Structures are given as structure tokens and as C-alpha cells.
């Protein structure tokens, strides 16, 4: 009954952060941790892995638009 | 069978006959127009 | 209908609609639906076109070489003394041609819009249909019907190549190709494209 | 409009007199800009208007060549003629000096008067009769200043392309030589390409 | 490159053959060959075991350099 | 700039001479029948006939005897640089559109990467032929905007 926040399951989303490798990138989301003292509760998949070799990190939701 | 197919397109092979083929053509080419520098045909 | 090929299925693009539909796309083309209309309007010009310059390069040779009358080659042509020069009649053309084909492309690119003769008001013009314009172009009033459109598209198809054969065996030659013709009749094993290599 | 079909973008609603929706480098879309390209235009038109005519009357009657009638500046005791008249200080310095005072004293002190509506049309005492009298009329003759300006630029365009590849003629002496012989005296023998 | 393409022309110019430029500048050989092989000879002669010349400096020179390049490696 | 064709120049002959006189001096050192001295004297009239040849398509030919192009843009010299450049411009267009399109195409699947490594041989042949449209096609894409991208940047 509390609002989960953070989008449903799917959405593709496209990132605001500037400071990562898929800034103005296409990722999709995994799930989102209901906590409210999580600091970045979203977690996204991506199709493009970055430098270190991995392919997921977090982020909060201002860094994210729920693109469709 | 298949298997050979899918192992025939893999880049080295493929590449390795379409260049031969390429190369092939242009001698054939020299040899039927030798030193062609210019377009003389038109 | 009739897809030139009695095994092939024929693709989504062609469906039969438009006039001449054989499914005649091996490379794919047209599948975008306005480009599709864009070479539409290509092949009915180039057609039209087609057709008169097979005409002007046959029908004349063949009435010179019978003696009723006496005209130079259609490419012998071009250096024979007329009552005008050259670069007067090709301006001549330029400014017209430059006026009725934008004008055909302003009609392209929006249907039903430059159609009355901006002149005078009346007399001008009863509403087309694209590439099949109105009034002042079919006096006759012929119906503009089926098997006409595919008759007039293969007709077309035909003088364009025919008019690239022309062109070519020119080239080879530079002989009249009725020539080449009373020479084929001659002997048709003795007379072809291998023997003039 | 000026071509049929076309639509006419947004900062072209007629509203003005010339008007024909023309503007396929889109400058106008700048209110400033807009204002200072009609008024460059007004003055532009109107001085070509005055200056097609100090062209041809001279061409035709008791003068010589319109490039002849300057001919005066490039050699020392050049002196300025009034159909066969060399006034007595119609010389190089009093005219240069005129031009200078009164071209600038006075576009100065017209430009430097922002109405803005006076400095594309004066009036003033330039209208003591009231040519002004209908407003109908008014943007009326306006929009016939633009159209027959318009064509005096053109026709100046055409003095320097034909004076180009006409090396030393006149306007008329080539209308009349091409006129006398249509097919074979025209555009042709200069460009085939 | 620049340098190389300067001196070679004015090195022509001077003896008044710039037809050998013209001729033998559009190869590399060309350039191994006419430019620096030839013109080389008169330095690395410099000093030789039947003494020495008033070029010994620059040959010396010369090697010096072909040294100290190659310790930046 | 001066430079006579070599249908009428004289260093060129003379380079002509020269090459052909060695030839035919190395010529002379086996049987008159020989295969090795039938291919010498073969090469013999080859280069003799690509000196004929040289001589006939206006080349205008050096102050030192050698042919030099002439790319100047007037179309009187253009069977050089013109038509064999827009021939090669076809070529190029040709292989960077059917590229482009069977990349755009295979891009739809779950690893793109495995149809990169090892292709799509059946699909890469029934894209490849397609070199015909390549200046139209390309044309209405960049008419409707569908050859270019805005401000999508990674990922895809
Ligand atoms: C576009 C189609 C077209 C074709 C196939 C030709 C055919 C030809 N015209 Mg041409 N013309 C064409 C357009 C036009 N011509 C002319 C008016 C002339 C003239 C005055 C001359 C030609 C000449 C030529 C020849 C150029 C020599 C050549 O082919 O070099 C490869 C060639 C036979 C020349 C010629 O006939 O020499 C044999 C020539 O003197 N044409 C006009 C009106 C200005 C045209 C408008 O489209
Ligand atoms: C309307 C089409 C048409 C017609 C009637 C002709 C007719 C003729 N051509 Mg020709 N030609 C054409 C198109 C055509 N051509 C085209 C498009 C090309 C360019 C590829 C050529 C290139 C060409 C050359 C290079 C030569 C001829 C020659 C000839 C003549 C001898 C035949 C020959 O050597 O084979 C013709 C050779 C071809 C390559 C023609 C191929 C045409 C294609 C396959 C379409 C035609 C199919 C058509 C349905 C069947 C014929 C229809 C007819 C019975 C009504 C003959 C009068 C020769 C000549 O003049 O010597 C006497 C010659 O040297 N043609
Ligand atoms: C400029 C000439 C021209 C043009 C614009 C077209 C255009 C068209 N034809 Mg067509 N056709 C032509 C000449 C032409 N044809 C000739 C000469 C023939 C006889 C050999 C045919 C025979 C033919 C058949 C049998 C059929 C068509 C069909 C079509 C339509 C769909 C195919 C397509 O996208 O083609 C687009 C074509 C081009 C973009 C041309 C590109 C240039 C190529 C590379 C030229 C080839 C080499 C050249 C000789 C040099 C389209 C409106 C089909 C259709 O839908 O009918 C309604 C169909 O069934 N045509
Ligand atoms: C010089 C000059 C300047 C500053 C302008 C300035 C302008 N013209 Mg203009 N124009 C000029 C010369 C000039 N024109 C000439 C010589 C012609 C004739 C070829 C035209 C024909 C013309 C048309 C047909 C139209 C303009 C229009 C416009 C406006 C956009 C802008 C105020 C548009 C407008 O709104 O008219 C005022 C318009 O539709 N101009
Ligand atoms: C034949 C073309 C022509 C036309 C239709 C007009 C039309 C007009 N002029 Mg005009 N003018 C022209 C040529 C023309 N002028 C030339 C060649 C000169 C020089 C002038 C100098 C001029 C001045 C100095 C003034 C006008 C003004 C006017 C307007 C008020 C009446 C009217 C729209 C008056 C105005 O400001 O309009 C309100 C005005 O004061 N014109
Ligand atoms: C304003 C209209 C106009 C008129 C009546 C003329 C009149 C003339 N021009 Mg001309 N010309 C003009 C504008 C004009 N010019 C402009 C603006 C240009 C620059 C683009 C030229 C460029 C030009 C050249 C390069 C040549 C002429 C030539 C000629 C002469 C005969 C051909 C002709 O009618 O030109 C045709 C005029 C036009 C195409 C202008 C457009 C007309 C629209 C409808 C207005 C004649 C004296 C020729 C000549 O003297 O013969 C050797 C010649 O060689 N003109
Ligand atoms: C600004 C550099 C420039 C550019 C863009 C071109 C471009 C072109 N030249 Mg050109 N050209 C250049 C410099 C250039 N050339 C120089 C330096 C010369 C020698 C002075 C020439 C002499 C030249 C001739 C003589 C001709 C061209 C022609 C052409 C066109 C074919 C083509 C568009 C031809 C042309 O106008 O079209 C046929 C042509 O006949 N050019
Ligand atoms: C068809 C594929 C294709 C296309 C359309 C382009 C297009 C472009 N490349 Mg490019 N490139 C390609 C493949 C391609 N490339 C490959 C495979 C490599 C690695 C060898 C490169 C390496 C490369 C570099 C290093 C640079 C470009 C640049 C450019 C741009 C300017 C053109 C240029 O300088 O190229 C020059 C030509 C080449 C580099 C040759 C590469 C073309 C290859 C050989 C074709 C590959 C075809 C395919 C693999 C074979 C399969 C056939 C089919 C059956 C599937 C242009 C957008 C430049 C740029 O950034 O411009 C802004 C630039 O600096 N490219
Ligand atoms: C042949 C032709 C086009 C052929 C194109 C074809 C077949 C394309 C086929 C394909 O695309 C499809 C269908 C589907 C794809 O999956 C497969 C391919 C194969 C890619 C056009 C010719 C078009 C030919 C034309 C338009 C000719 C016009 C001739 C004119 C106007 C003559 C003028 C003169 O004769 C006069 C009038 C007077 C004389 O004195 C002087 C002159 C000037 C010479
Ligand atoms: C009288 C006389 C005689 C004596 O003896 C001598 C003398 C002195 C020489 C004389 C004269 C003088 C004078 C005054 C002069 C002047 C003139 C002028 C002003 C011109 C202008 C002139 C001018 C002109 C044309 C102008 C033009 C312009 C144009 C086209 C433009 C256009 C455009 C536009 C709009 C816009 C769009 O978007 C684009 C474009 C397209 C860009």
C-alpha cells in the first residue's frame, strides 16, 4: 500500500548521470529496493559492458528518465 | 554438416576466399589491359 | 499478378493496386511507400519519354531510306544548319522546361494545388489524378480505365530499352539501326553483337 | 503568394506591403533584423529608381556612354558636361566635397531620427500636398515602390552582367543589335555551358 | 621533412642541375640514393686512417649525434 | 604549362629507344626459339605497344619524358583523375552502404557480436546485391531524417 518508488519492471530508462560510462544511455531496470535509507535503491542492465567489465550499478531516481 | 557451415562463416576462412577471388579478378584484369593508366573510353 | 517468375512469392510491396504489379523487386527497392510513389512517377515519365524518342529515332530513318523523304540521323542531326542556332533553341527550351516541371513538382509534392493556369480564372482545370493529369491533356476523353495504365506501362518499359539498345548499338557502330536490321535479315548467325567485336 | 503550394512561414502573414512570403534563409525571424532588412530595402529600391534613369537618358540622346560620363576623374583636366555643357566648377573637388557635405550633414541628421515609421517613408514636408490622402492608396503606391524598385535592382544586376560580357557598350545599342537579328544575337553564344 | 624538402632543392639549385630534383624526388629511393648516400660522402670521409680534414668536427659531430639518439631509446 | 603531349615529344621516344634497345641487347644471349627469349620478346613489343598506347589519349608528357597527369578539373584531360575518381566513389559508396544496412539490420537479434564474428552469410547475400541503390536509397534517408541521430550517443 506504501507507493513503491522507482519504475515498475522493464522500463527502459536513459541516464542523467554525468559521471558514468552510459551517461545519455539506454539501460533497462532490475528491480529497485523499497527502503527508504537505501542511497541508490534502482539498479539497471545494460546491452554495452563498460571498462572494468561490468555491466550493472546503481543509481538513485533523479538520475533516471523513464523513457518508453 | 551444419556445424562445418556455421564454421566456414567464420570471418578468417570467408575473408581469406573473397580476397582471393578480388585478387584474382584484378590480375586478370591487368593482364587483359596492361599499365592501364588512363580512361580511354571516353 | 503475373509475378515473372511462376515459383516466386510475390513481395508485400507490390501488391497489385497499381497498374503493371508483377512483383518485379529482386533488390528491394521501393518498400518505403513513398518512394514507391516517388519511382512511380520516374517510370511514367521516363516511359512517356522513352516512347517518343524510340519514335523520333525509328519512324525517321525508315522514311528516309524509302525515298519519300530526307532527314539526317537523329544523332547526325545535331550538326546539320536550321533556321535558329543551337544555344538559341536550348535557352528557349531551359526557360520552358524550367517552368512546366517545377511546376509537375509543386503538383508532386502537393496534390491538387497549382492546377489552374494562374492567368485567367476560368478554363483552368478539373481535378486529376497523379500522374494521369486532367482536361487539356486528354482531349479524346478517353477513360482513363485499366488496361490502358498497363498497356501504356509496358509499352513504355519496352521503349526504354529499346532506346538503350539504340543508344549502345550507336556506340558500337555508329550506324543506323534499321541497317542493322537489313543486315540481321541478311544472315542473323553472320550479323550480331559477336562478330563486331 | 510568390509560389503556389509552398506554405509561407510563420513571420510572413502578408502584413506588410511586398510581401509575397519569400524568405527561404529564414534572416526575418529577428523583429530588429526585420525592421532594418525593410528599411536597407526601401533605401536600396529607391536609389536604384533615381539611378536607372541617369543611365538611359544619357545612353540615348546628346550624351555619349555612361561610363564615359565619370571618364573625367581618371585623367587630370577632366571637367563634368551637361548634355554639351562643361559648367565652370563642375570639376573633380567642388563635386567630391558637395557629395561628402551633403550626403552625410544630411543622412545624418534623417537616420539619426528614429520614428522608425519616418525613416523608410519621410513625409513630412515631404508630404504637404497629402499624397497621403487615402489610406487605400497609401499602401497601395507603397506596394508599387516596392515591385518597380525591386525590378530597377534587377535591372541594374543586368547593366553589370551585360557590361561585363559586353566589353564597352550600351544598354540599348545591344537591345537593338540582338533585336535586329532574334536567333543568333542573344544569351547563346556566351554560355552553352 | 620540411627541412629535408628545402635543402635538397636549394642543394640542386645551387649546382644547377634542379633536373636531377625533378627527375629522381618522386621515389624514396630517389631520395636515399641522390640526397643522402651522395651528399653524405664528403662528411663521413672526414677523418679516415690516412689522417684528417677541417670536416673532422661535424663527422665527429655527426656520429655523436647517431648516439645520442639512439640512447633515448 | 608547356608540356607537350608525347605523340610529338622527343624524350619520351628516346626512353622508348633506350628501354627496348636493352631489352633486345638482353635478348641475344639464347636460342631465337627459346620460351625465356619468346616472353622477352613478348614483353618486348608490350612495352612497345604501351608506348603506342600512351601516345594516343592526348597524355601531355614531361620536359624529362614521362607522362603527368593533368587533374586541373578540364574535362579535355579527365580520362585520369574524373571519371575514375566518380567510378571509385561508386565503388566506395557501393561497400559503405551494404555495410551500413547489413549492420542495421543484424543489429535486431540477442548477440549482436556472434553475427559480427561469424556472419550471416545467407542474409549477407540477399543484403550485399543491393550496391544499385546505394546514392538513391541513402538520398530519401537523409530526405526523411532517417540517416542520422540527435543526441542518442552510447549504448546504442
Ligand atoms: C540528351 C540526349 C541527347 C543525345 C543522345 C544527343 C546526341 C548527340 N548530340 Mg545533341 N544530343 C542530345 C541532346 C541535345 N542535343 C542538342 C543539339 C545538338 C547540336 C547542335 C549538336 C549535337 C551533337 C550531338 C552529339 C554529341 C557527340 C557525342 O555523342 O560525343 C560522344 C551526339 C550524337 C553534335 C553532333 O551532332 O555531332 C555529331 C552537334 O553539333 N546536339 C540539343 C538542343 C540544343 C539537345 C537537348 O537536349
Ligand atoms: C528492344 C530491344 C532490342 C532489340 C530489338 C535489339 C536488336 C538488335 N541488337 Mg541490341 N541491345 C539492346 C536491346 C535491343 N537490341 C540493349 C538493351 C543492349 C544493351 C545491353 C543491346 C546491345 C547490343 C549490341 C552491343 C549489339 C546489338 C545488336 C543488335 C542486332 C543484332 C542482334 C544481336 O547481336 O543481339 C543483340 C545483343 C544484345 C546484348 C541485346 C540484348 C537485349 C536484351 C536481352 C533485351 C531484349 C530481349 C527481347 C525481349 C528479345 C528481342 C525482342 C525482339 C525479338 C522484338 C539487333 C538488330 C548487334 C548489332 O547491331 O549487330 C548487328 C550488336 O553488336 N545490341
Ligand atoms: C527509369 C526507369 C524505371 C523506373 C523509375 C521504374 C520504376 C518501377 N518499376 Mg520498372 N521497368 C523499367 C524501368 C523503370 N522502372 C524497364 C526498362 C523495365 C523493363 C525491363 C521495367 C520493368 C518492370 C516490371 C516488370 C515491374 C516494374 C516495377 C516497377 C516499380 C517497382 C520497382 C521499383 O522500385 O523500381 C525502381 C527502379 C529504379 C529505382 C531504377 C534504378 C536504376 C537501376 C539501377 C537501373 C538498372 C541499370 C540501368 C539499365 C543502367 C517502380 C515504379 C514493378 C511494379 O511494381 O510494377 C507496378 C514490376 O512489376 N518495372
Ligand atoms: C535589398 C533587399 C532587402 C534588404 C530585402 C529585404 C526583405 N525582403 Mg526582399 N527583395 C529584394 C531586395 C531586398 N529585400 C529584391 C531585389 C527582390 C526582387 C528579386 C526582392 C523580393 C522579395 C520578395 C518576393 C519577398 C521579399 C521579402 C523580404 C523581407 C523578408 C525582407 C524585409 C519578403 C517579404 O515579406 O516582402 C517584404 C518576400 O516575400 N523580397
Ligand atoms: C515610381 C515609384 C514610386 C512609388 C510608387 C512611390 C510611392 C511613394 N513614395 Mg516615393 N520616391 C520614389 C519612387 C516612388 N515612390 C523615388 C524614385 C524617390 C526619390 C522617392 C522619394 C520619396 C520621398 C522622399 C517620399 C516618398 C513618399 C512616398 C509615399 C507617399 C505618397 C508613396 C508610397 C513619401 C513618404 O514618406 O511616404 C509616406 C516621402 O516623403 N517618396
Ligand atoms: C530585367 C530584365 C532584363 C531584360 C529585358 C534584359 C535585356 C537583355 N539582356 Mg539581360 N540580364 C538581366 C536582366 C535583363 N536583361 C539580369 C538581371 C541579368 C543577370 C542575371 C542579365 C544577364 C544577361 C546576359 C548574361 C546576357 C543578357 C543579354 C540581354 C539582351 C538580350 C537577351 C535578353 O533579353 O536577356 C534575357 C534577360 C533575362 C533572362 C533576365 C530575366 C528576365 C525575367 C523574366 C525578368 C538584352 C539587352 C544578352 C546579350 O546582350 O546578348 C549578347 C546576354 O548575353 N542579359
Ligand atoms: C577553387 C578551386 C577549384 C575548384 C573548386 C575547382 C573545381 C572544378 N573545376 Mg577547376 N581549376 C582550378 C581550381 C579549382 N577547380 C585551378 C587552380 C585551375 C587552373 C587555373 C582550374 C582550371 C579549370 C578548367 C580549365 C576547368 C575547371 C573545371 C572545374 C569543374 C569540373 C570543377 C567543379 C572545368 C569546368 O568548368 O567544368 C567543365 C574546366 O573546364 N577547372
Ligand atoms: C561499412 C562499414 C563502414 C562504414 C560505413 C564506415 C564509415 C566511416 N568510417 Mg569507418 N571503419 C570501418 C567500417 C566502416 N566505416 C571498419 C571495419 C574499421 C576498422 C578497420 C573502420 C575504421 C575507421 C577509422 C579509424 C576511421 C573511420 C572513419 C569513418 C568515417 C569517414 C570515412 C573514413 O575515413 O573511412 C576511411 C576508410 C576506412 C577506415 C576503411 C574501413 C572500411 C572497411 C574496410 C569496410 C568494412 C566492410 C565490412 C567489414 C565487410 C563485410 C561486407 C558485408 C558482406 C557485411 C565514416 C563515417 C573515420 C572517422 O572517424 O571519420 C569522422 C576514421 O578516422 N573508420
Ligand atoms: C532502361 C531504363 C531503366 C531501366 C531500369 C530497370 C530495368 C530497373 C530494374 C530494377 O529496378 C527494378 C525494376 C527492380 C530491382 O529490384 C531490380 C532492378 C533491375 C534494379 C530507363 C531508360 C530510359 C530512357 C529514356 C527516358 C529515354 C528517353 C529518350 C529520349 C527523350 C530521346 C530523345 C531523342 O530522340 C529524340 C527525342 C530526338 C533525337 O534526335 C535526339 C534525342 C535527344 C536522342
Ligand atoms: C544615375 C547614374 C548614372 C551615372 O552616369 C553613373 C551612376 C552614378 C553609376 C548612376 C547611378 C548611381 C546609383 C544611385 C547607383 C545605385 C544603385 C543601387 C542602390 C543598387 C542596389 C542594388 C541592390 C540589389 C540589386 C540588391 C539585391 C538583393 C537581393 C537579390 C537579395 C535577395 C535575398 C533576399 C531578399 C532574402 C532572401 O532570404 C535571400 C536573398 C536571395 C539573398
Not at chain 6, 53 to 82: A, M, T
Request: proline fraction near 7%.
Amino acid at each position: 500500500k506504501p507507493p513503491p518508488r522507482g519504475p515498475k519492471r522493464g522500463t527502459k530508462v536513459k541516464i542523467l548521470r554525468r559521471e558514468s560510462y552510459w551517461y545519455n544511455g539506454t539501460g533497462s531496470v532490475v528491480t529497485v529496493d523499497q527502503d527508504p535509507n537505501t542511497r541508490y535503491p534502482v539498479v539497471v542492465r545494460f546491452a554495452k559492458v563498460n571498462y572494468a567489465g561490468v555491466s550493472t550499478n546503481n543509481y538513485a531516481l533523479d538520475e533516471i528518465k523513464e523513457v518508453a | 554438416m551444419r556445424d562445418i557451415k556455421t564454421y566456414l562463416s567464420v570471418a578468417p576462412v570467408l575473408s581469406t576466399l573473397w580476397f582471393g577471388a578480388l585478387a584474382g579478378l584484378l590480375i586478370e584484369i591487368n593482364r587483359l589491359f596492361p599499365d592501364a593508366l588512363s580512361f580511354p573510353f571516353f | 499478378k503475373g509475378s515473372w517468375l511462376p515459383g516466386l512469392q510475390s513481395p508485400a510491396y507490390l501488391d497489385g493496386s497499381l497498374a503493371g504489379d508483377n512483383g518485379f523487386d529482386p533488390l528491394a527497392l521501393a518498400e518505403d511507400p513513398e518512394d514507391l510513389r516517388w519511382f512511380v512517377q520516374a517510370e511514367l515519365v521516363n516511359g512517356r519519354w522513352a516512347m517518343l524518342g524510340v519514335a523520333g529515332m525509328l519512324i525517321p530513318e525508315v522514311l528516309t531510306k524509302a525515298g519519300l523523304l530526307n532527314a539526317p540521323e537523329w544523332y547526325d542531326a545535331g550538326k546539320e544548319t536550321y533556321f535558329a542556332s543551337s544555344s538559341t533553341l536550348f535557352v528557349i527550351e531551359f526557360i520552358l522546361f524550367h517552368y512546366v516541371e517545377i511546376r509537375r513538382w509543386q503538383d508532386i509534392k502537393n496534390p491538387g494545388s497549382v492546377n489552374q493556369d494562374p492567368i485567367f480564372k476560368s478554363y483552368s482545370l478539373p481535378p486529376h489524378e497523379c500522374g494521369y493529369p486532367g482536361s487539356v491533356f486528354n482531349p479524346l476523353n478517353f477513360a482513363p480505365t485499366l488496361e490502358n495504365k498497363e498497356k501504356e506501362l509496358a509499352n513504355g518499359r519496352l521503349a526504354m530499352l529499346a532506346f538503350l539498345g539504340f543508344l549502345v548499338q550507336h556506340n558500337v557502330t555508329g550506324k543506323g539501326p534499321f541497317e542493322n536490321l537489313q543486315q540481321h535479315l541478311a544472315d542473323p548467325w553472320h550479323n550480331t553483337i559477336i562478330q563486331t567485336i | 503568394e510568390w509560389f503556389p503550394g509552398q506554405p509561407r512561414p510563420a513571420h510572413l502573414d502578408g502584413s506588410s506591403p511586398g510581401d509575397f512570403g519569400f524568405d527561404p534563409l529564414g534572416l526575418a525571424t529577428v523583429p530588429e533584423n526585420f525592421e532594418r532588412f525593410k528599411e536597407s530595402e526601401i533605401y536600396h529600391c529607391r536609389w536604384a529608381m533615381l539611378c536607372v534613369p541617369g543611365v538611359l537618358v544619357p545612353e540615348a540622346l546628346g550624351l555619349g556612354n555612361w561610363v564615359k560620363a565619370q571618364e573625367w576623374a581618371a585623367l587630370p583636366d577632366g571637367q563634368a558636361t551637361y548634355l554639351g555643357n562643361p559648367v565652370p566648377w563642375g570639376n573633380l573637388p567642388t563635386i567630391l566635397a558637395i557629395e561628402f557635405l551633403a550626403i552625410a550633414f544630411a543622412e545624418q541628421q534623417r537616420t539619426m531620427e528614429k520614428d522608425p515609421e519616418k525613416k523608410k517613408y519621410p513625409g513630412g514636408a515631404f508630404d504637404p500636398l497629402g499624397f497621403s490622402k487615402d489610406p487605400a492608396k497609401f499602401e497601395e503606391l507603397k506596394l508599387k515602390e516596392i515591385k518597380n524598385g525591386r525590378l530597377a535592382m534587377l535591372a541594374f544586376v543586368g547593366f553589370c552582367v551585360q557590361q561585363s560580357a559586353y566589353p564597352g557598350t550600351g544598354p540599348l545599342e545591344n537591345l537593338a543589335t540582338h533585336l535586329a537579328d532574334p536567333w543568333h544575337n542573344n544569351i547563346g553564344d556566351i554560355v552553352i555551358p | 621533412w620540411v627541412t629535408f624538402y628545402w635543402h635538397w632543392k636549394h642543394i640542386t639549385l645551387w649546382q644547377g642541375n634542379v633536373s636531377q630534383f625533378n627527375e629522381s624526388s618522386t621515389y624514396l629511393m630517389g631520395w636515399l640514393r641522390d640526397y643522402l648516400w651522395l651528399n653524405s660522402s664528403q662528411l663521413i670521409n672526414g677523418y679516415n686512417p690516412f689522417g684528417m680534414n677541417s670536416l673532422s668536427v661535424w663527422a665527429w659531430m655527426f656520429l655523436f649525434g647517431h648516439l645520442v639518439w639512439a640512447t633515448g631509446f | 604549362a608547356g608540356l607537350t603531349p608525347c605523340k610529338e615529344s622527343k624524350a619520351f621516344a628516346k626512353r622508348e629507344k633506350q628501354s627496348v634497345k636493352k631489352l633486345n641487347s638482353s635478348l641475344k644471349k639464347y636460342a631465337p626459339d627459346s620460351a625465356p627469349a619468346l616472353a622477352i620478346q613478348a614483353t618486348i613489343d608490350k612495352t612497345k605497344r604501351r608506348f603506342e598506347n600512351y601516345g594516343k589519349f592526348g597524355l601531355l608528357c614531361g620536359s624529362d619524358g614521362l607522362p603527368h597527369l593533368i587533374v586541373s578539373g578540364d574535362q579535355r584531360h579527365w580520362g585520369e583523375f574524373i571519371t575514375p575518381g566518380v567510378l571509385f566513389l561508386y565503388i566506395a559508396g557501393w561497400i559503405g552502404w551494404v555495410g551500413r544496412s547489413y549492420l542495421i539490420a543484424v543489429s535486431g537479434e540477442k548477440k549482436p557480436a556472434m553475427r559480427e564474428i561469424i556472419i550471416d552469410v545467407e542474409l549477407a547475400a540477399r543484403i550485399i546485391p543491393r550496391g544499385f541503390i546505394w546514392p538513391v536509397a541513402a538520398y530519401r534517408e537523409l530526405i526523411n531524417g532517417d540517416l542520422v541521430v540527435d543526441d542518442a550517443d552510447i549504448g546504442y
